[PDB]
Amino acid sequence: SEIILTPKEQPEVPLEAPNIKPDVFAGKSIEEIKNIQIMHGNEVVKLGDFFEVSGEPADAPEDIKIIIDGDVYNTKRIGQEMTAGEIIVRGNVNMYVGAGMKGGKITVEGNAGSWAGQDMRGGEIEILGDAGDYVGSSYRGDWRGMSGGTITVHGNADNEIGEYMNGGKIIIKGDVNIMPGIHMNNGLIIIEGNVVARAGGEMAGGTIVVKGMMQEFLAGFKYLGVEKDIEVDGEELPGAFYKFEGDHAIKGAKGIVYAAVGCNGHIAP
Amino acid sequence: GKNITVERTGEENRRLIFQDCLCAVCGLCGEICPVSAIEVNPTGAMVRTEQEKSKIAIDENKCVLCGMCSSICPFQALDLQIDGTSIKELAEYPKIIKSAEIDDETCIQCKACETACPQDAITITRELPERKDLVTGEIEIDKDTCIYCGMCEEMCPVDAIEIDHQTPSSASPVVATDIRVDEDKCVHCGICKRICPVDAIMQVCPEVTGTSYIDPELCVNCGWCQEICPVDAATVTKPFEGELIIDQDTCQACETCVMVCPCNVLSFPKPEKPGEKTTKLHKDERFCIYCGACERSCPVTAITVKRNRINTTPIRSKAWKNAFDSLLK
Amino acid sequence: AIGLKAYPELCHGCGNCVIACPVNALRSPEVAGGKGPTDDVEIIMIVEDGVVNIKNPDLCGKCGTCVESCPVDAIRLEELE
Amino acid sequence: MRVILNTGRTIWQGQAIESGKDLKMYVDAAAIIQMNPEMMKQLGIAEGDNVKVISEYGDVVVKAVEAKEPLPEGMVYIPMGPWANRVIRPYTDSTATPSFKNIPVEIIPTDEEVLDMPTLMKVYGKVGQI
Ligand code: SF4
Ligand code: SF4
Ligand code: SF4
Ligand code: SF4
Ligand code: SF4
Ligand code: SF4
Ligand code: SF4
Ligand code: SF4
Ligand code: SF4
Ligand code: SF4
Ligand SMILES: [Ca+2]
Ligand SMILES: [K+]
Ligand SMILES: [K+]
Ligand SMILES: [K+]
Ligand SMILES: [K+]
Ligand SMILES: [K+]
């Protein structure tokens, strides 16, 4: 069952809409969905004030597909803590897309702001454009971050992707800036493009794979040699990779960084 | 920038990708194309000079995405994909039989093949044993007998001895506060015990692992690894069989073919002694793949390539059989 | 297509290209040995009136040897149309 | 010339902000670019000559002065203030804190004048809101 949200003009003061999720839409009529509360800065407003609503209701969230038929560049927390069903955004989203989600799937056809999939527990997020900082990160002060789910970004991402990661998987098909996998404990990060610096900084566990060039790396890592045609958590990666263990600035560190031999000769000692 | 993609969508999607960086400008794709859709630029010019153009041009109005050019290319520069899968994984498409492999159990990680490979397709690594495991002995300095003369520290060939030197003060009226031997660095040569003027020193006297990897996209099946290997761990099979013929008198030693050859077959030997004469253009066909780039590059046609066989199982399609047979000479 | 092009206004008339060319060297033993031709011969280019002058462009194989021999970029291989 | 722009405090910029940001001494303390004498020689300038600083984020005219606190090769120093903040990196990397230090900039000599404090702020085009 498809429920269509057609955005009216997005406001300059952003909207916060954590109630845009199949779990809230389940069991509500089209008229009840228009009355769902969202924030517009320091005022509470109705979903209907900023979106046209149409389609067919459904009683269970697993049978709901929300289609946002337009750009929602100034709408935060879409799909926050969703457990089932699907959201497709035919445009951009602001921060916190799918933050804390437990299941289901979110597809963003455009770009996403920072904290996409922050604290993710399960399900899937797919961003066809670029993402901001803190893809699949933890919250300020907490030492327990993302514990499951898959995040795929087809474009580029910025800093601290997988910050304090404790499970799940992050795939960046483009490039990243600095500190991917900062304080990582567990999980898998695959960067198909390049890294500027500090991959795996202060990591204690988990695996980071860089298929492109790492411009700079870290002296706290131990070089283990080359591995070929590697397989990590079911992902088959053909070719040769320089293998490093660290970050030994951390006590008892067991993290692994794989970097493609072809463009990382300057990183190997 | 320099790569070319010819694509056609529909019921069945077909996509031909050309990678300029892998192209050796041999001309075989242009020769095989049954509709003459490809124009290959001059071999010498594309290798020896700076050019903004791609090495080949594919006419979209003539190409029918048959895949013959992708199949023949000895350099993996042309790849035809049908519904996302490469023709090299589809048994319906004729495939040239070739290979290059290293037996990991036989290999001793000597790195000679890595150095010899003309395409830099090989990665050889090795984990050497730690220095301490290649020497055996015991060493001890009596710090009460030691007078801190510094002769052992100076003479030690590996800097294993360290003295904590200092300028004396009235609170610490000594020239040094400690002396230590780093047993992980010591090679048990016995120099320190022999130079000590007060006999303060007592001194008395793991297999190589690694990884071997051949990149299948860069490898051109030249056979340099197989020939150079001291233990016969590397095995190579070639796509074509043929012959090279050089006319030494026609050759004017411009060096174009030498620079063009992607398999390092051709060279200009240097005379060993003054007044000795050498072969103007030297070949070693053990490394040749009969690609034809050398002949194509030569402006005076002093070097020619004959191709006697293209290694495949019997070709079923008459169009493909006729195209492959046109490359034999 | 790519072909031989002269820039006589940049040329020193040094003769490096004339001598380096394997087609010219094959056709003229004097040229092969570093001299300008005295015997009548049909070669790709010669130094005439102090500058490089292309005489038989159809004999050029576009190898790039002449180009490496010129430090002032007065003889090139480029798109002629 | 491509250089690295560092920014921060000087005791003179401190004295000037506490005396008055509307005084000539604030322009003399903060609308400046400190450079090693070797860099001034490379550019062909002397102390007191003006320099046009251009980054990906903006542009500014400041007065060249010889650095009394030596710089590493290829680095320049503009004291914190609105002249420096025309050209440094605004982006916070999702931390709230901009990149005030170590930004690539292009520097060339100029005959244009340094703008005083009220004139520099007119580049933003404040529109009255009441
Ligand atoms: S067949 Fe020869 S010329 Fe054609 S793409 Fe392959 S390497 Fe280049
Ligand atoms: S795919 Fe077939 S038609 Fe197209 S260029 Fe290659 S050989 Fe010619
Ligand atoms: S040579 Fe003997 S006395 Fe001199 S410093 Fe070494 S141990 Fe001490
Ligand atoms: S034995 Fe040779 S290597 Fe060991 S400490 Fe003495 S001098 Fe140095
Ligand atoms: S066959 Fe030639 S190209 Fe292939 S790995 Fe051996 S030496 Fe390198
Ligand atoms: S030459 Fe032979 S032994 Fe030496 S590294 Fe290569 S394959 Fe191994
Ligand atoms: S064979 Fe032809 S291309 Fe090779 S060096 Fe001799 S003249 Fe030049
Ligand atoms: S010598 Fe053999 S491998 Fe080298 S360019 Fe000629 S044909 Fe190709
Ligand atoms: S084109 Fe260049 S190499 Fe040839 S004569 Fe002129 S300056 Fe000399
Ligand atoms: S490109 Fe080669 S053949 Fe043509 S004129 Fe220059 S050297 Fe002679
Ligand atoms: Ca945290
Ligand atoms: K090599
Ligand atoms: K010593
Ligand atoms: K051998
Ligand atoms: K030829
Ligand atoms: K030149």
Q: What is the DSSP string of D106-122?
A: EEEEE-SPPP-HHHHHG
Query: Which three-class secondary structure state does DSSP give residue A140?
Result: coil
Query: Which three-class secondary structure state does DSSP give residue A138?
Result: coil
Residues comprising chain C, all counted = 81
Closest among D77, D79, D90 to D27, alpha carbons compared:
D79
Other Cβ atoms closer than 10 A to B141:
20
Compute, in degrees rounded to 10, the torsion defined by CA atoms B56, B61, B63, B65: 120
Q: Is C42 exposed, middle or buried (0-12, 13-18, 19+ CB in 10 A)?
A: exposed
Query: Which three-class secondary structure state does DSSP give residue C20?
Result: helix
The Cα angle at residue B129 between residues B127 and B130, in degrees rounded to 5: 115
DSSP state of D128: -
Closest among B188, B282, A160 to D95, alpha carbons compared:
A160
Structure determined via: X-ray
Other Cβ atoms closer than 10 A to B112:
16
B neighbours by CB contacts (3+ pairs under 8 Å): A, C
If you take atom 2 of ligand 10, which residue's CA is the nearest one? C63
Rounded CA separation A157/D102 (Å)? 22
Are the C-beta atoms of B39 and B53 separated by less than 8 Å? no
Pocket test for ligand 5, best of B76, B124, B221 (most atoms within 8 A of CB): B221
Rounded CA separation C10/C8 (Å)? 5
Rounded CA separation A29/A49 (Å)? 17
Q: Which residues pair with B304 in a beta bridge?
A: B245
Rounded CA separation A258/A245 (Å)? 9
Q: What's the gap in Å between the CA of A125 and the closest CA on chain B? A: 24
Closest ligand to B28 CA? 1
Q: Are strands B78-82 and B85-86 parallel, antiparallel or unpaired?
A: antiparallel
CA distances from B208 to A224, B105, B282 (A): 14, 12, 38
Phi and psi of A14, rounded to 5°?
A: -60, 160
Q: Which residues pair with A54 in a beta bridge?
A: A4
Residue partners of A21: CB distance under 8 A and separation at least 6: A61, A66, A78, A79, A80, A81, A82, A85, A87
Are the C-beta atoms of B296 and B25 separated by less than 8 Å? yes
Mutation target among C63, C65, C73, C78 for the B interface, most CBs of B within 10 A: C63
Q: How far is the CA of B118 from the centre of ligand 12 (A)?
A: 5
Q: Which numbered atom of ligand 9 lies nearest the CA of C74?
A: 1
- Cβ–Cβ contact B118 with A under 8 A: no
Rounded CA separation A217/A197 (Å)? 6
Token readout for B148 is 């801190």
Residue partners of A31: CB distance under 8 A and separation at least 6: none
Closest ligand to C66 CA? 10
Rounded CA separation A174/A210 (Å)? 11
Closest among A44, A100, A97 to A66, alpha carbons compared:
A97
The Cα angle at residue B82 between residues B78 and B87, in degrees rounded to 5: 55
Distance from the Cα of residue A134 to its chain's centroid: 8
Rounded CA separation B153/B164 (Å)? 11
Rounded CA separation B201/B192 (Å)? 7
Pocket test for ligand 3, best of B142, B143, B149, B194 (most atoms within 8 A of CB): B149
Rounded CA separation B93/B126 (Å)? 40
Are the C-beta atoms of C2 and C40 separated by less than 8 Å? no
Rounded CA separation A197/A215 (Å)? 6
Residue partners of B286: CB distance under 8 A and separation at least 6: B223, B227
Please state whether the peptide bond connecting residue C39 to the residue before it is cis, i.e. omega within 30 degrees of 0.
no
Ligand 8 binding pocket includes B24 (Cβ within 6 Å) = no
Ligand 9 binding pocket includes C53 (Cβ within 6 Å) = no
Instruction: Give the binding-site residues of ligand 3, using a 6 Å CB cut-off.
Output: B 141, 146-152, 179, 195-196, 198, 200-201
Q: What is the DSSP string of A5-72?
A: EEE-PPPSSPEE-TT-SHHHHTT--HHHHHT-EEEETTEEEEGGGTEEEEE---SSGGG-EEEE-S-B
Q: Which residues pair with B306 in a beta bridge?
A: B243
Entry resolution in angstroms? 1.9
Q: Tell me the CATH number at D69.
A: 2.40.40.20
Rounded CA separation A30/A184 (Å)? 43
Ligand 1 binding pocket includes B38 (Cβ within 6 Å) = no
Whether residues B49 and C77 touch (CB distance < 8 A) is answered with: yes
Closest among A95, A85, A112 to A15, alpha carbons compared:
A95
Rounded CA separation A71/C69 (Å)? 60
Are the C-beta atoms of B148 and B159 separated by less than 8 Å? no
CA distances from A200 to A163, A209, A210, A267, C49 (A): 10, 10, 11, 14, 68
Instruction: Give the binding-site residues of ligand 4, using a 6 Å CB cut-off.
Output: B 139, 156-158, 160-161, 181, 186-192, 203
Q: Which residues pair with A186 in a beta bridge?
A: A166
First vs last C-alpha separation in chain D? 45
Enclosing H/E stretch for D49: none
Chain A residues whose beta carbon lies within 8 Å of the beta carbon of residue D94 = 114-115, 132-134, 158-160
Rounded CA separation B208/D41 (Å)? 57
Taking CA–CA distances from A158, the nearest residue in chain D reads D93
**SS3 labels along chain B:** CCCEEEEECCCCCEEEEECHHHCCCCCHHHHHCCCCCEEECCHHHHHHCCCCCCCEEECCCCCCCCCHHHHHCCCCCEEEEECCEEHHHCCCCCCCCCEEEECCCCCCCCCHHHHHCCCCCEEEEEECCCHHHHCCCEEEECCCCCCCCCHHHHHCCCCCEEEEECCCCCCCCCCEEEEEECCCCCCCCCHHHHHCCCCCEEEECCCCEEEEEECCCCCCCCCHHHHHCCCCCEEEECCEEEEEEECCCCCCCCCHHHHHCCCCCEECCCCCCCCCCCCCCEECHHHCCCCCHHHHHCCCCCEEEEEEEECCCCCCCHHHHHHHHCCCC
Closest among A244, A237, A239 to A268, alpha carbons compared:
A244
D neighbours by CB contacts (3+ pairs under 8 Å): A
Closest among B78, B208, B200, B92 to B147, alpha carbons compared:
B200
Rounded CA separation B220/B307 (Å)? 17
Rounded CA separation A221/A245 (Å)? 5
Rounded CA separation A151/A116 (Å)? 9
Chain B residues whose beta carbon lies within 8 Å of the beta carbon of residue C18 = none
Question: Tokens 């045609």 label which residue?
Answer: A229
Question: Tokens 């199982």 label which residue?
Answer: B313
Query: Which three-class secondary structure state does DSSP give residue A2?
Result: strand
Ligand 6 binding pocket includes B113 (Cβ within 6 Å) = yes
Number of H helices, E strands in chain D: 4, 6
Ligand 2 binding pocket includes B323 (Cβ within 6 Å) = no
- With touching defined as 3 or more inter-chain CB pairs under 8 Å, the answer for chains B and D is no
Chain A, chain D: beta-carbon pairs less than 8 Å apart? 12
DSSP state of A155: S
Query: Which three-class secondary structure state does DSSP give residue A131?
Result: coil
- Cβ–Cβ contact A239 with B under 8 A: yes
Closest among D2, D7, D16 to D86, alpha carbons compared:
D7
Taking CA–CA distances from A179, the nearest residue in chain D reads D93
Residues comprising chain B, all counted = 329
Q: What is the DSSP string of A101-121?
A: --SSEEEESS---S-TTTT--
Other Cβ atoms closer than 10 A to B131:
12
Taking CA–CA distances from A160, the nearest residue in chain D reads D93
Rounded CA separation A106/A114 (Å)? 16
Closest ligand to B113 CA? 6
Phi and psi of B321, rounded to 5°?
A: -60, -45
Q: Which numbered atom of ligand 9 lies nearest the CA of C45?
A: 4
Are the C-beta atoms of A85 and A104 separated by less than 8 Å? yes
Which of C26, C62, C68 faces B42 most closely, judged by CB atoms?
Answer: C62
DSSP state of C34: T
Domain tally, chain D = 1
Rounded CA separation B162/B148 (Å)? 11
Edge-to-edge order in the sheet of strand A43-46: A43-46, A37-40, A15-16, A75-76
Rounded CA separation A228/B214 (Å)? 10
Phi and psi of C50, rounded to 5°?
A: 85, 0
Phi-psi region of A59 (alpha: psi -120 to 50; beta: other; left: phi over 0): alpha
Ligand 9 binding pocket includes C3 (Cβ within 6 Å) = no
Q: How far is the CA of B26 from the centre of ligand 1 (A)?
A: 5
Residues comprising chain D, all counted = 130
Are the C-beta atoms of C44 and C4 separated by less than 8 Å? yes
Rounded CA separation B326/C10 (Å)? 46
Are the C-beta atoms of B237 and B220 separated by less than 8 Å? no
Token readout for D67 is 């650095």
Whether residues B48 and C64 touch (CB distance < 8 A) is answered with: yes
Token readout for D98 is 């901009």
Q: How far is the CA of B107 from the centre of ligand 6 (A)?
A: 5
Here the contacts of A137-146 (C-beta below 8 Å, separation 24 or greater) are A137/A161, A137/A162, A137/A163, A137/A164, A137/A165, A138/A163, A138/A164, A143/A183, A145/A119, A145/A185, A146/A117, A146/A118, A146/A119, A146/A120, A146/A121, A146/A170, A146/A187
Q: Which numbered atom of ligand 5 lies nearest the CA of B116?
A: 7
